[PDB]
């Protein structure tokens, strides 16, 4: 039983309960982001699941502010709480300094919140991964962040069930500085490459931002033109 | 200081001047007293600069957050109610300010909030040491039926009058028009100056 | 024993204690809600259970304010506590802003309260699901909310023992923008479709609200006209 | 400010005027001082606007909550007792207000609550700087036997007199009638104006 | 071991420790209440148990105020603590509002206190059930309330070992709006129907209240006239 | 293991740890109290246990004030702490109201302190029973109080190893309103009846109080006249 | 496992962890005290244990003030902490009242501190016994105090490994009101009677106090005159 | 199970959970530091791991201030939190005294933070080791610091998987007072000596500082000149 | 399992976890102190362990102030924390009274800190022993202090792996009032007597203080003259 408590190391120096939290993330539907020419974008598959659901409501891409967005994968309620934290944390920085110079620090604060919940007994980790993408004073940024509080910056990445399919596809096909439309196409291709063949990709979410602008969310009909 | 907010049929016009004094000593001639705080919302500040500036930042933050959480802008009356609660919560250690909050939701609105959290809606309102002079001009010259162009001229006149008689007021007149169609647009300086000339005025 | 503590993930990234809390919900009697033309409604079956009970008292539809109502299923005492939280939370928002612009945020606050009790040891989850329905500045709304803190917006949904019967029936028969009386009939049908045949549906609770109005609770005799 | 609340056999009539001053400076001519706070309950406010406005919101919230929890409306005397406790709890850092609470439960009631939480019931009551003038009119002209129409006229007269002699009072007269039958109805402006003309008066 | 901790759900969504608290209630002697014409009453069996006890002292019906009373069954010390809470809670409401408009809310406050002790580790539930009966502004009221915090309003009900005997008997014989003396007789009959035959009912406690009056406790000799 | 934690109910609704605390009481030496004509008395056996002890010191009857006394049985250190609590609690009531109108409330406060320690994990119960006897505005009073926080008022009762011997004897021989000397004799007889025959009762403690007087402690020579 | 937690009663009403703390006391070297004519004394054996130790330093008799002393037996570090508590507690009383009227109360405060550590989980008991001896306004006093918080007043007593030898010897030979020198001799004899024969008693500690005086510690050469 | 709790010693006086935290450190990539003529340097291998990562971002050498740097090895999220602590702690000292006289004290504060998490239950240790190198008023300094809070000052040392290879190599080849370029070469050699042969060293991180200067980070092209 | 928790006594009255802490001390390298003519000294072996370590830095003798020094053995991080506590505690006394009259009280405060960590669950003991030596108003002092909080004053003593070798050697050869140089020689001899033969004593640390002076640390070359 090196397996049952967030505060117990295995004899090899592992924290299995953190690693299990990471398996929660795998049950989420795939999302991805990539940097392109003067910008960054996010695409999220949506496990669409009944015509009785309201579609234009509950959805995985969430604006953190006008210049920064996140997608999450894993336990939904955990994700919601972390997105709210991200939002409040963003505004605290804006009130203190007047702006958000480096998106990395927002992500670090979220990642620190997560790391705490891997070190003190009495809580479980968040079963969530996030991708954060936006423009800041360094440029267009793309980070992920996992249940352990681990951060990395990417040119392109994914989270969710289809992570590995989408990552190896991008490892093959990805190029820097694509125009936006080619970036989106590449993304849709990559996402498709992760589906069980004889399984059609329904309309995903797409959001993009380019230097000197605010985020825009593609509406369904703009997205279909890529399907 | 002189700030003013007026309402017309489908618009809100807000203006200020820019003088910052420590007593009789004019330390800054171009301070900022008019701020966009949401897509269709503006705020003017009078009173203690530090307290005002903090509140401007809070409101920007709190309304941006609300909008993302609700996917709709905060109703203008909601913004006034929020400020009402905040200022009253600390009435014995108050924010020493007078605030105007103006915007469009389903209709145009201007609210005046005081340092104890008292908030009252009105068709027009003015704040700061120069406000009584503005109230003179508005009583005599304001019509509900005015066009946006007439409104912009009216506020320029009111603030010009206040500048002439309140030594605590001065500097460039600063104007924002808020409509559903174009949102919060801050008029450019060329244009304001142009109308100061066309109306035959000064500073 | 990946099974015994709210703070333990299974090796597959599951929180079984939360999933068990969800089994408590299944022991409750079925309730449902659906959006219709400029409105939303709720119907709740009531396991009527002795003539010695006061009927006109203890009942599953509860007004949160004049424009928002909830039905619950699961542990009754837990439900009561959550409905009171919902009521207080609603009034807090009304005092802060003067009104309740988006019902989604009320629901989120309740869902967050519930998520908390799935992450800190020392507490168990609430064994309750709720449906929330009302009118706000977006329009007529219908959400559910489960022991995990998971939220979804629906055109129609159900909770309780008969959930699956009622949901597949609605998946077949449901249409948007019905007039109120047809909506109620469809609902009564769906509810009936979940009973053991040779089992009669007794008088359920029905509440409705249409844009620009307050909620109305149907009284027993108005309800019988649909039985 | 002038507010009044009277009781008749099966009714309660509450009225205010709308002027908001900072000293002698009339900043707002149409503030609101009469509020519905429950199905058969109304409240008038005088004193510091911020403190009053916060209390209005608390009472709306607290009575809506009570009504859902109890499935009956809070008794009018219970509303007064609640305000009594809240205001007295903070007597040394008080809400600087005078409140009238009027409504129907099993009978009509008007309560007057002060800034230290003292609450007294009475057949009629008035608050604000203009109240002494109202008390004059009411002493001379109020009858228990008055009809609702006669009552509405009486309060219009009382407030019109107060407006004529209290510079802190002015603006449109604002009237609510509370009956078991129709609940809290706020009279429309056409109708109030009409009676001002029929009684031969001004502002 | 889904059995040992108040905070652990079983895989079927049960809280066995709460259910075990409920078994404590069954070891108490039976008590009952019923609504009658413009009133409500309580009758409690007393397991009389030695001539060395002071009878006119320790006894199960307790006034909460002049218009509301309670009987309890289960762990005595727990009951005492809950009756005191009921009393203080009643006076808090009276001081806040001037009166107690709806007895349901007093009961809810007691039921909420009880529900708490079924959700936070570190405490056990109260092993008590209560019946509350009184007159308020709605009319004559009768509630029960169990270790789980579950509330119900009744025309008639019972608690304790003989619950089921007394409840089925009342399900057969009970009628609404009896005069007081017939109500008391029906009650004494129901209580007798729960005893092991060849076992005599000794003098029970009886208390009643009718609209526009205070509670009265029947003295022994008035009770005997029904035996 | 329904047996190891004060907060765990057994499946029959028992708190065994509380029941075990009660066995601690059985290891104490017997004490008793009885009401008599206009008074109440206490007699305590003292397991006398070496000539090197100071007798006139450590002893089981303790005055709570001039009008109220207690005897205890069980864990001595626990008893001491509870007698101090009783004393302080009595003085708090005296300061608040100027006098102690009903001894029952003092006893309840001590019983409540004891019940607490049967409901919160992190503490064990007190292994003590107390008898309290005194005169108040109701009259002469006699209560006992056990580790569970259970209270009863008696005409006569006992605590300690010989409880059952002493109680059945008093059930047979006890009469109300005896003069003091006859009450004491009856008490000595009852106490003797609990000893292993061929075992002599050594000098016990005796204290009495009669209406309109303060307590008096019998000195050894006054006691011997009854041996 | 009724054995492992200070808060668990055994089914017979025992606190074994407290009884084990008491075994710690048995590993300490024997000490004793006895009352004599207008006075009280303490003698402590010292397990002398290497010539490299400083003798005139670390030693078992400790003055609490000028009129009250203690010897301890058991865990040394625990003993130190308790003697410091005794000292502080004594001064608190002196500051509050100007003097220490009854040494019993000082001892009770120390005993209470010890009883606490036998009732709340999260702590272990002190593995110490103390003898306290001094003069107060009652006269010469001699108490002991054990890990349970149990107190007794004696004419003579002992603590430590040789307790039973020293106590039965004193039970045989002890007489009240001896002059000091005879008391000391009797004490030295008693102590010797507890050693393994062919084992010599090395110089012990001796302190005495007589009415109207301060404590005096016998120096080594005064002690040898008794060896 | 002497193995499962940070607060348990094994019978040999070991804290295995701390030792396991130390195994986490071994999974990190190797880094090293050495003092040279009037200076100190750091070299860190970077397990480069996909072209989709941003390289010029996430990296193991981190400036604590202009005169003090750290490399870490082990759990990344833990390392991040400790580096932030180091930074804040440095600034606290600067604000208190105006400068950082002795780098040893900064390191001690970090090591103390780490030791805490090896002594209080409810937390796990940090799975990190750090090397700190900088110039202070004593001179050029080089410390390491492990999960236990153990500190040592070195002339040269390493952390991570290749620790032992790099340390024995330096034990053979190291000389004091090398010029900077020779120091770097020796370092690159040492690092290479730890790789599996037929495995090429990709571009590492290198930072240096010499007395009277600020730190400089070598850019990639300067580093390649040594590969 | 009487073995796993600081708060559990064994049935013999042992605290094994404290005894295990004590085994940690045995893994430290040997250090010793002895009183000599008007002075006291400390000698510590240093397990020298690589030429890459900085020697003149990390070292076992630590000044507590100018007149008081300590050596430790056991867990290094624990030792550091305790030495800091000793230093702060010393200064607290100096501020309160203006000087440190009796070093024994400093040692007691450290020993009390250590005893605490053997009595409250949630912490482990410190795995450290300390020797303290210095001059105070009584004279030259030499104490040790172990994980249990046990204190003793000595003429000579040792701590660490070679404790027993060094102690028996000193039991044979030690004499009081040696001149300093003879004391140091005796100490070096004793230390050597504890090594595995065919194992050379490398340069140890030596510090001494004589009445009316401050401590002096011998530098390496002064030490070699004794090797």
From Swiss-Prot, chains A, C, E, F, G, H, I:
PTM per Swiss-Prot/TrEMBL: The N-terminus is blocked.
A single GO cellular-component term on record: proteasome core complex, alpha-subunit complex
One Pfam family linked to the record: Proteasome_A_N
Disulfide bridges in this chain: none
Alphabetic keyword roster: Cytoplasm, Proteasome
Impact after mutating residue 76 to D/G: Prevents PAN to stimulate gate opening
Activity regulation, free text: The formation of the proteasomal ATPase PAN-20S proteasome complex, via the docking of the C-termini of PAN into the intersubunit pockets in the alpha-rings, triggers opening of the gate for substrate entry. Interconversion between the open-gate and close-gate conformations leads to a dynamic regulation of the 20S proteasome proteolysis activity.
Compartments it resides in: Cytoplasm
Signal peptide per UniProt: none
CDD domains: proteasome_alpha_archeal
An example Gene Ontology molecular-function term: endopeptidase activity
GO BP annotations, alphabetical order: proteasomal protein catabolic process; ubiquitin-dependent protein catabolic process
Main localization, broad class: cytoplasm
Family listed: Belongs to the peptidase T1A family.
Note: The configuration of the closed gate contains an opening large enough to allow rapid entry of tetrapeptides but able to impede the entry of proteins and longer peptides.
Cross-referenced NCBIfam families: arc_protsome_A (TIGR03633), PRK03996.1 (NF003075)
Subunit structure: The 20S proteasome core is composed of 14 alpha and 14 beta subunits that assemble into four stacked heptameric rings, resulting in a barrel-shaped structure. The two inner rings, each composed of seven catalytic beta subunits, are sandwiched by two outer rings, each composed of seven alpha subunits. The catalytic chamber with the active sites is on the inside of the barrel. Has a gated structure, the ends of the cylinder being occluded by the N-termini of the alpha-subunits. Is capped at one or both ends by the proteasome regulatory ATPase, PAN.
Function, as annotated: Component of the proteasome core, a large protease complex with broad specificity involved in protein degradation. The T.acidophilum proteasome is able to cleave oligopeptides after Tyr, Leu, Phe, and to a lesser extent after Glu and Arg. Thus, displays chymotrypsin-like activity and low level of caspase-like and trypsin-like activities.
UniProt-recorded name of the protein: Proteasome subunit alpha
Species of the source: Thermoplasma acidophilum (strain ATCC 25905 / DSM 1728 / JCM 9062 / NBRC 15155 / AMRC-C165)
Curated annotation (Swiss-Prot), chains B, D:
Remaining remarks: The configuration of the closed gate contains an opening large enough to allow rapid entry of tetrapeptides but able to impede the entry of proteins and longer peptides.
Name the record gives this protein: Proteasome subunit beta
Purpose: Component of the proteasome core, a large protease complex with broad specificity involved in protein degradation. The T.acidophilum proteasome is able to cleave oligopeptides after Tyr, Leu, Phe, and to a lesser extent after Glu and Arg. Thus, displays chymotrypsin-like activity and low level of caspase-like and trypsin-like activities.
Predominant localisation class: cytoplasm
Single biological process term from Gene Ontology: proteasomal protein catabolic process
Keywords, alphabetical: Autocatalytic cleavage, Cytoplasm, Hydrolase, Protease, Proteasome, Threonine protease, Zymogen
EC number per UniProt: 3.4.25.1
Lineage, highest ranks first: Archaea, Methanobacteriati, Thermoplasmatota, Thermoplasmata, Thermoplasmatales
PROSITE patterns attached to this UniProt entry: PROTEASOME_BETA_1, PROTEASOME_BETA_2
Stored PANTHER family: ATP-DEPENDENT PROTEASE SUBUNIT HSLV, METALLOPROTEASE TLDD
């Amino acid at each position: 039983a090196y397996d049952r408590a967030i505060t117990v190391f295995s004899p090899d120096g592992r924290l299995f309960q953190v690693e299990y939290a990471r398996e929660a993330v795998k049950k989420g539907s795939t999302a991805l982001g990539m940097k392109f020419a003067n910008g960054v974008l996010l695409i999220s598959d949506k496990k669409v699941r009944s015509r009785l659901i309201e579609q234009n409501s509950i959805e995985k891409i969430q604006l953190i502010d006008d210049y920064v967005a996140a997608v999450t994968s894993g336990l939904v309620a955990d994700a919601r709480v972390l997105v709210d934290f991200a939002r409040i944390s963003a505004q605290q920085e804006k009130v203190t300094y007047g702006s958000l110079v480096n998106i990395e620090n927002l992500v670090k604060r979220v990642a620190d919140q997560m790391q705490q919940y891997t070190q003190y007994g009495g809580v479980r980790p968040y079963g969530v991964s996030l991708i954060f993408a936006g423009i800041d004073q360094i440029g267009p940024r793309l980070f992920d962040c996992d249940p352990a509080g681990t951060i990395n910056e990417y040119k392109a990445t994914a989270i969710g069930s289809g992570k590995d399919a989408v990552v190896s596809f991008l490892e093959r096909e990805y190029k820097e500085n694509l125009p936006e439309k080619e970036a989106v196409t590449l993304g849709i291709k990559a996402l498709k490459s992760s589906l069980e063949e004889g399984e059609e990709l329904k309309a995903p979410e797409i959001a993009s931002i380019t230097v000197g602008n605010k985020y825009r969310i593609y509406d369904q009909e703009e997205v279909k033109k890529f399907l | 200081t002189t700030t003013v907010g007026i309402t017309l049929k489908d618009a809100v016009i807000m203006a200020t001047e820019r003088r910052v004094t420590m007593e009789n000593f004019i330390m800054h001639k171009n301070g900022k007293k008019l701020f966009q705080i949401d897509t269709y919302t503006g705020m003017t500040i009078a009173g203690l600069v530090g307290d005002a500036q903090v509140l401007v930042r809070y409101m920007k933050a709190e309304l941006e957050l609300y909008r993302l959480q609700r996917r709709v802008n905060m109703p203008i009356e909601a913004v006034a109610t929020l400020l009402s609660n905040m200022l009253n919560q600390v009435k014995y250690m108050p924010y020493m300010v007078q605030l105007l909050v103006g915007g469009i939701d389903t209709a145009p609105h201007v609210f005046s909030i005081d340092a104890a959290g008292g908030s009252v809606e009105d068709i027009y309102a003015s704040t700061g040491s120069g406000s009584p002079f503005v109230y003179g001009v508005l009583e005599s010259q304001y019509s509900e039926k005015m066009t946006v162009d007439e409104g912009v001229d009216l506020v320029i006149r009111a603030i010009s009058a206040a500048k002439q008689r309140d030594s605590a007021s001065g500097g460039m007149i600063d104007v924002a028009v808020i409509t559903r169609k174009d949102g919060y647009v801050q008029l450019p300086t060329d244009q304001i100056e142009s109308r100061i000339r066309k109306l035959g005025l000064i500073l």
